[PDB]
Each structure stands twice: as structure tokens, then as C-alpha cells.
Amino acid sequence: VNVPKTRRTFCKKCGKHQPHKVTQYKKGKDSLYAQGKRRYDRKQSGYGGQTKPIFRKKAKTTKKIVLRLECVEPNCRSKRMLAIKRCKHFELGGDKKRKGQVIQF
Amino acid sequence: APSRNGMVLKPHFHKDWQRRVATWFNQPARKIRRRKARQAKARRIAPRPASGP
Amino acid sequence: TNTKGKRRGTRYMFSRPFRKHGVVPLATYMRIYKKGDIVDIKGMGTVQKGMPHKCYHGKTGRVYNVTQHAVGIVVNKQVKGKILAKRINVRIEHIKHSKSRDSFLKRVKENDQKKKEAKEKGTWVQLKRQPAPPREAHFVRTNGKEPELLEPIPYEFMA
Amino acid sequence: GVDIRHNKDRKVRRKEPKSQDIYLRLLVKLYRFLARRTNSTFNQVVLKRLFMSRTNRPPLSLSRMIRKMKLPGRENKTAVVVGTITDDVRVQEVPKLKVCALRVTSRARSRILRAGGKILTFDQLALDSPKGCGTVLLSGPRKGREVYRHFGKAPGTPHSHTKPYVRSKGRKFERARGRRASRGYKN
RNA sequence: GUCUACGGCCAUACCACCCUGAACGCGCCCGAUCUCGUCUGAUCUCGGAAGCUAAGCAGGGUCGGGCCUGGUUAGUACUUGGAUGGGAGACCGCCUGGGAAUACCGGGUGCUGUAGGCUU
RNA sequence: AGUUUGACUGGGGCGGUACACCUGUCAAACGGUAACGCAGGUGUCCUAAGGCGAGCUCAGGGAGGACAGAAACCUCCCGUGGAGCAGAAGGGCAAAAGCUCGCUUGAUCUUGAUUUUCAGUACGAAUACAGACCGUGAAAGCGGGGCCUCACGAUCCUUCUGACCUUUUGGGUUUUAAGCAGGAGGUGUCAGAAAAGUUACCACAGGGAUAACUGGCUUGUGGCGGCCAAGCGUUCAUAGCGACGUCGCUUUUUGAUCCUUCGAUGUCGGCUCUUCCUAUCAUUGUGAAGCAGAAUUCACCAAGCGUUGGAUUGUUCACCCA
RNA sequence: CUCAACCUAUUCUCAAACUUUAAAUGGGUAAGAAGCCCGGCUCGCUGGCGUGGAGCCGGGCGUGGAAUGCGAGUGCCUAGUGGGCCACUUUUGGUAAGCAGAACUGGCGCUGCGGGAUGAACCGAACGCCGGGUUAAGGCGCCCGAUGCCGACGCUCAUCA
RNA sequence: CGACCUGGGUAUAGGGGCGAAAGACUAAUCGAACCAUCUAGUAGCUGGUUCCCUCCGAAGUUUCCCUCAGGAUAGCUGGC
RNA sequence: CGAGGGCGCACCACCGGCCCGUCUCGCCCGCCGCGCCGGGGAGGUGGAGCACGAGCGCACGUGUUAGGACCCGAAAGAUGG
Ligand SMILES: [K+]
Ligand SMILES: [K+]
Ligand SMILES: [K+]
Ligand SMILES: [K+]
Ligand SMILES: [K+]
């Protein structure tokens, strides 16, 4: 799919529609000091081997694309997460399509 | 198995409890024995207060 | 084995009648639906919004809520051995006033007025409707004509 | 053979008290005679309440009795309850009351008598009003019991406000999945 | 007796061809400065009033098609319930109630609401 | 060393997915309704193919017009949709829901109610509202995704976003961490374990809920008959045959099923021995012939009697010698 | 002149996944006192309007507004079960099956009894222990209760009836 | 007459030994001996489950489950 | 006996009201700390709440569960000899 890099949508901080700056969200890096990671590292230390399941049965081929909207109003830089449907190919601000055009031979 | 409405119960009887059971059939005898010791101690410290300091 | 799709088996039920496709007539939008009146749930297929489910088509309920475009209907549904009153939002395209309740209201107005007139002039009149009584005795006149004698016809092979 | 069903032939109802209280049995004898030999429906109701279990004879607080006695047209009437009358320490003024009860709490009894009231047992009520004339038959709150908080629809069903059975109350005890939208669902 | 504007039901109203149309009306019609749109004032928008009912439109006509409604088909097809009915079966008959659809043969060819005109 | 090595299944395995879904049908005119029933489809795609408004009319056909022809473009006429609406199918749709433009982001922020599956739990999807902030249009209005029916995912953990929010343990400041609310990272065995084989060296609990061998039902297949008679028989349907069709019988084939037996009915062949059947190879008595005789063929009554010795093969069968 | 295509009016035969038309059986609702009719009051919703709608407060109306039958309402706790099978009819796969799979009602399972010689399911009928009377379905040569009727009318000879 | 037969004494002990190799042998036990204990191991599987009368009286269906010989759930039952 | 009328238990349905969480809107009030302070309102919505208590103790029965768990039954695993 294709979505523009900018859009005018509701901003909860401003309480109104404001122009927003659209980027794709990526999962951040694991903290190593998150409580679950701390519990996991304690559980894995010593003898016993693997103490938690390891998925290894992938079935999905796509992910739900998450759009990171940032209000452009310089006092309000509040960010929101918008999720769109699953897609195989996602493009950010690509060339818009025209209708009455010759398909390149 | 759960059956209809009820309280999710978690009894702590998975640890061979029957080998460590404290019965209290000597409780009446224990109360008698401490009372004899109390009376004997009071006689030993004849004018001093029975309870102690 | 059957799918659980909301419109499975509605090929003919939600289809329009023959030569009655196209624009929805506007009198169906001008009908007035109060609270507590009885409406039949059709479910026309021209309008896909606010459609009743296939289990309410041909059912009759009572209006309990009125919105801009739809109504709230309390309609009885039987699930296995229990009948329970479902509440469904249906756009006015898929409902129409039930004439069973309209005819009975007319009869009540006749009954109450007829009782009033009877007291004013004096004597007693029958209000309840009775089941079709056995036919009374009557004379059937021959009129100087002998009844025609019928006879079963011989069999011969058609085609 | 006849075509009937026999599953409802035997009506399930108390025909006598399951208690062996000989004093209760004596006044059951008294009111069994009164119900039979009079046309008073008051005696019939009182007799069948005497059979009832303790949960079906809830205690009547003093406040509730006073409030029902204060209703218009009930002056100089006997308050009759087939059960225990209980002191309510939430009230400060006890009026004059004529009362018949199976049983009265000591503190409630002292408060009624100190206010110039009169307390009768059911044998004395028979002599006073054999047909129950001039009486107000009261009852304690029948569903004022902890069990009825747990009865009804199941707690894990939509629009049900019935108390679940939990050994403890706290943030760790049945407040997660199925109770909040963040944890799967709420309904 | 009609028409115009807005309609309700949405062919008894549609389709094809022919005839008639007084008065208002509705139109066709004339023009492109302005408003507004075009490749094109054809359409749309605007400004008009020389001409015309040719056309739209209205009414009528057609052993007209369609549509609507009857008869026939036919108490036929089918069918609720019944029998220790028939028949090797396939199926069929009867009792008890309900009961269609073509072909074929007739009749009909918009009713009407609100507001406003014309019709001696 | 420890453990695992899915399920369904006309036995299991192999094969398929009938394991989560959607359309038509089955389905017996409410709804519901099964088989490894039938015909198919799905794990996507789309800043437009979403939202408004406006203006148009589509498939196809006929008739015309330089190059131009069966199809290039232009014009008129007919055209109830016979086109198109992303995809499977069904429904729906014409100054539409289709095509082309213009402006846009309602595919946004929220709380509840309801429908569908249903236990009337959840997810998913959907309907009607209400409160904001917007888009479009002159406006009425319409829009919180796709005309409708599918296009999807719990707890735990992680990650991001939001509240000049709460907690961080004697107090205070600041990092950090924990929390509250909402998205995402996935479990397709799709209400969601983390999982390769082999055993004929095998074991246990069971199962006739379930296969292999008898019996039982069935008789497609095998085997044996019948009806019609186009033809064969030099000629001549029917001496002897019998195409195209069609009706049966049998249980000596092989399937189909899984009713009995899994705390056990000893599983092939041969040997030996008895009896039974007839759909008769021979013998007795007959009828028919394309019966001269001889031989042979068809048929009837008919199972009294007989139907053998051997080579190769475990064979049943088979084939040859006599 | 003929054979094609095409068109027109006809003609034979069809559809589980076609249809103009369209049953029988079937599904929902209504057949009143929570109703009807008079007034009045409240609203921040709606609005040209004393509007619209909803709610609330008084008052009057009983011929109790089809038939038939029946006494109803409501709560708590709860076992067993979650292998089914059979028959009429409808019905899917299969050549078919005492096969496999559905629908509806009844039954067997859980059920004895009379009849079908015999038999889980068929027909009659369901059951405390008995006497008398009468039947159902089915029978009445003999087994074996009952035709041991002067029963009625026909049909049929079978060397597999 | 030989990689010959055999007594006695020694050594190797259980996931170990020993094997001219058969998973052979290791006290009638070997694809992991024997003895005691953990241990009354677990079993959705098989078998059994003890007096009388009276009253009521089923289900093999729904949904979910590594679910298909089992449960949970609704339904059907009884009691109060 | 009695047409009518009245007070209405428990309980049921419904409409209001009150407490805590969370949203939306908005205007006031308090002071030894004038604060990034404290309190209050209206309208929705979440709660196992309030709304003149019903509990506690003891006994008995039934049901579920952990225990050898109604009784008997593995193939196995471990420790030490
Ligand atoms: K199906
Ligand atoms: K299907
Ligand atoms: K009851
Ligand atoms: K159907
Ligand atoms: K839902």
C-alpha cells in the first residue's frame, strides 16, 4: 500500500485536527533491564537448559503496519500510533497513480 | 475437575504431610505439668512474687 | 460444516421481487414509528445498511427505541428450548407497520363506542366474536327443476 | 393407561417444622387448631411461617419494625413477626410498641420495655387476638443474606454483577483477564 | 374538460406507429454584454420574445406487443394426517383435509394529494 | 542424560484437510441441520479501489466517414443493464453503488448499547446511537474505511505512544525500574504445548469402539442363464449361433461393509476320509441336427456309478507326457 | 439452382448449485384493565407554531372483549449422561448392503404384557395384589382357547400348488 | 596334538562386566541381573463395589478443549 | 356476609438518589503554608458497593477438591546394597 508522509488528523494534545508527520514505527531495542528480561536471565542461569518456550512455528507472512504520527505544531510534538491492515509491500509517500496514462510498453 | 460455581481452592497437601502431623492429645497433660512447675517455683521463692520481677 | 456467514442462505430472501428493483419508494421513509407499536421485519436487499439478520426476517416485534434512521425492536427469538427477547437495530427500510395490531385497535374503538351507544339506547348487544357456528336449518327450493343427475365418466387414455 | 405426568404430583412444602423444639411444636399445635377452626387467613400465614426454616425467618431489626409501625393508620396495632426481633443501635428514639415475636434480643427487649412498650409471645397473641385482628404482620428482609450476592447470572457473563467466590480480596485475586479490557476482555 | 409546479402508489402508467390539440400553460425558438461552462453558447449558465405546435407534452386510435385482472387448464399437478390397502418392485388406488402453474379464451389500458391557471 | 516425535480418518499408514474462515447447493418454501457430499474461494489488495459533490452512461449491435482492412479514431440510432463495481460465488445498484473530474483524509479522538457465533463466554466482523474534531456540498445531508456476505489472534513477555499521572519501601533531589490506558511483535493444530526417527529384540494397559482369517448382509466384478432378433449359417433369424439393447440367477472370484470373535475359533498347500450339490464329462433311457454310416453338436429325465498314473512348481492355479 | 451462416414465427425434450408464476405442511405477531377515553403538569430533547415526542399527575369507563383445557410464579443445590440404535415418511454418497450420513415424530435402550411359531425396534396395549364382565391387534380343522354357522358369491389343480 | 579337554586358585559387577559377536553370557532371570526401599508410584484403561420397601426419573445432543475410549459447558434428572 | 376504599410486609420489575474509579464540560470557594495547593458542580460510563445491618459459633447432610482417597492392577523411573 501507499500512504502520504503527511496527513491532517486529530491531535489529542491539541484537541483538534492538526497536520501530522507520518513515519513507519519500528520496535525498539530490548532494555535487558526490563523486569521480564531480568526474570528470564535469572531463570536461564545455571543448569536446566531452556526454561521458556521458543515459538518456531511461524505462520504469518505479514505484519500490521504501524504509523507514527507526530503533530507538527512546534509546541505540541505529541506522537500517536496508528495501525493499518496487513500488507506485503508498504511504501511511505510514493508516487501517486494517474489514470489516463499509457502503461510503459 | 471444577464443577459449577465454587472457590478456586489451593490446598497445601502435596508434600507428604501425613508424616509430620502434630496431635494435641498431650495438651491436657501439658497444662497440668506447667501448672505443677508454676506451683513448685512459687514455693521455692516463698515470699518473692510468684510471677517474677 | 455449514459456514457461519451472516448472509449464508439469503440468496432469494434478500433479493428483490421481480420487476421491483431500483429506487426505494419514499413512502417507506415517511412512515411514523412510535414506541410500543408492532412492526414486521422484512429486510430488503437494496439497502445493505442496518439489515436485520436472517433469523429475524418474517418476524414481528415491538419498537422500543427510535433514532434518526433506524428503530430498536424487541423481537422474540427461539434458541433451542428457550425463547428470549432480542433487541435489534433495524433501518426503517427493512420494517413496516403490522396490520394485525391495527385491525385490533379498530375493533377496540368499535367495541368501546358500541358499548357506549348500547347504554344510551338501552338493550344488550354481542361484543365477543364467536367461532363460525354450525349452519342453521333452511329450505332449498327446487324451483320446478329436477336436480341434474351426475354420473362418473368412463376412463379413456389422455396422452 | 392414562396420559399424565407424575413428576409434579408431590408438592414440595413444609407440612411441619423440621425443628424438634418442643415449645415451637406446642404453639404449632395451638395455631394448627386456630387455622383449622377459624376463617382467619392471618392464622394460616402465621402457621405456615412457623414451619419455615431459619433462613426463611430472617431477623427483623428494630429500625425496620419502627418504620413499618410509623406508617399511617397503624397506630395501636400489634407488630407480629414469626422470628427474632433485633436491636438496631442506629436509632435513637424508640416509640411505644405492642409486639409479638418468636424471640426478642435482650438489648432490643430492654429498649422496647423501657419505652413503655409491650412484648407478647405467640401463645399470648392467640388470647389477645385469636383471629389476628388489629395486627401488622411483618417480615425481616428475606434476601438480606450474603448468599444472594453470589446468586444470579455467572460472574463471567456480560451485565452480571454477582459476587464471585474468592478466598481473598486483592489486586492479585481475579482482577485480570476477563475483568479489564487491557487483559484480554472485560464483559 | 384540461394544464403547470411539487408529488404518492410506481406499465391499467411502458413500447411501436397514426390522428387531433381552442385558451392559459409547458415547450420548441432568438441571442452571448453580463453570471457560468464548453474542442464547439450543441449541453450547462445567462439575456430575451420574431416565429411554431413540426417536435416534446396532452387526449384518442391499433381484431397492436407488453402489463393488470378474470375464465379455462382443474378439483388436474402437488400435498397434511390414516390403514396388517394393492403390487416382486417401480410405483399406484382409497379415506381425511388443503389445492396450484403454462398453452388457450375474455375484459381493462392510470388513479390520486396539495398549491396555482385556462376553459361564457 | 532427559524428553518429544499433533489430530481427523469407512482399520492404520501413504494421500487429502472436510483442523480457522467465506459463496451457491445439499436443506425437505422461518431459522437450524451431517458425510474424506457437490461447485468454488481465503491468509491478500487499495492515498485510493477510502469520504463528499458534480457531470455523464455501460456491454453489445446497426448505419455512415482519407489512408483504415475483422478489429485504430469520428458521428448518429437502438440498447433494463445483457457492462462495471479488486478477488470466489450469491445478492444489490442507472442523471446508481458504475465512468471522469474537483476538493479532501470519517481509514481520526472517545464512552457505553446491540447483532452475528453463542454457553447467549471470548475473539473477529457488523448495526444503531451519543460526545469531540473535521471533510465535502449551495444545501438538505452524507462520511468515523472499501455496496453487503470472508480476509484473522488470549494470558506471560517485549516494544512504542499518553497523562507538568501513581509507586519506587525512614525523608528529599535525580537517573532507573514498576504501574495505569491505547497500538504493535503470535500462536494457520487458527480458544493460542517449545518437539525427529526406528524396533522382526521389544513391553504394558486396553480395544472386537478397529484391520488381517470364518460366518452374515450386498453382487458392482467374476461365473451361469433368459427375452427381442439386425445379422452368421452357399440359401435360410431362431440345426447350431446371437450384435444393439434388456431381465435374472449364483455365492466355487474379487471387491464393499465392519455385525460376531483381540482374558486367542491355530493362519496356505498337500495327504487321508466321508458325505452332499448339479449348472451332466462318461455311462442308462430319450428328443433335435446343416443326424447317410462313422463321428460330432444341441436339449430332456437323470447325481446310481465313475472321473486316473506322472514331469516342473510349496503352491491353489498352470502346463505338458500317457 | 443448391447447401451454409443469420433472422423471423413455430416445434421436441430438460435443470441440486435456473426461473415469471406458485401450493400443502410450516414460522412470527395480535385477540385489552399494563386497555380505551378525558383533562392537566414537566423537559436542558425537537421546533414557524398553543410544534413534535417522551415522562409525570388526576378523573371516567367491566358486556373481563374467540374456542378448548389447565392452578401458577420463582430460587438454590444437584447426580447420571455427553459410544446410541431402530421404524413410517423426506433425504445425501454408493451397484448395493442387516452400508455410511442428515430431517421429523415415535420407539428400543430403561419395557413387562396380548398377537406376529420363533425375534430389542412390527401390530395392540404400557404394568400395585386380586374376582367378575368386555374388548384391541390377532384368530376360531388338530396341536391350541374360539365356526361342531346345514355361512354367502365366485376363482383355482400345480409330476417344485 | 590342538585356536584341544578339564579341576582348583585368582581378576573383571549392572548402564557395569565379559563377548572368535548370537544382543550372547553375567546363579533355571538379560535389548540392562538380583535384593530392599522411595511405593499403597501413575493409569482418561480393564475387573469388582455387600439390606429391604416407597416416590421421582434420564442421556448419548450444543459449544470449547493436543479434544476423538476423557473433561469443561448448556441441555435432560432429582431434592429442598 | 359485604360492593367499594385505605395503610401496605417480604419479594419482583422499573424510575430516581448516594460512595469509589475513569472521561467530557464548566464556574466558583478556602487559607498561618497563595501553591505545579486544597475543596466543590453538571453530564456519561467502570465497581464483587450504599440505600435502618445478619452475622458469628456449633452440629448434620449433600457436592467438589488435595491427600494412598472406593478396592485391586502396569510397562517403567530413582537410591542404596
Ligand atoms: K453443507
Ligand atoms: K458450504
Ligand atoms: K416449584
Ligand atoms: K434451505
Ligand atoms: K461480539
Ligand SMILES: [K+]
Ligand atoms: K456539515
Ligand SMILES: [K+]
Ligand atoms: K503494551
Ligand SMILES: [K+]
Ligand atoms: K489446537
Ligand SMILES: [K+]
Ligand atoms: K453378479
Ligand SMILES: [K+]
Ligand atoms: K462376497
Ligand SMILES: [K+]
Ligand atoms: K470382520
Ligand SMILES: [K+]
Ligand atoms: K481376536
Ligand SMILES: [K+]
Ligand atoms: K500333491
Ligand SMILES: [K+]
Ligand atoms: K508332482
Ligand SMILES: [K+]
Ligand atoms: K451436568
Ligand SMILES: [K+]
Ligand atoms: K458433563
Ligand SMILES: [K+]
Ligand atoms: K586350567
Ligand SMILES: [K+]
Ligand atoms: K541396569
Ligand SMILES: [K+]
Ligand atoms: K476415534
Ligand SMILES: [K+]
Ligand atoms: K476422596
Ligand SMILES: [K+]
Ligand atoms: K542388597
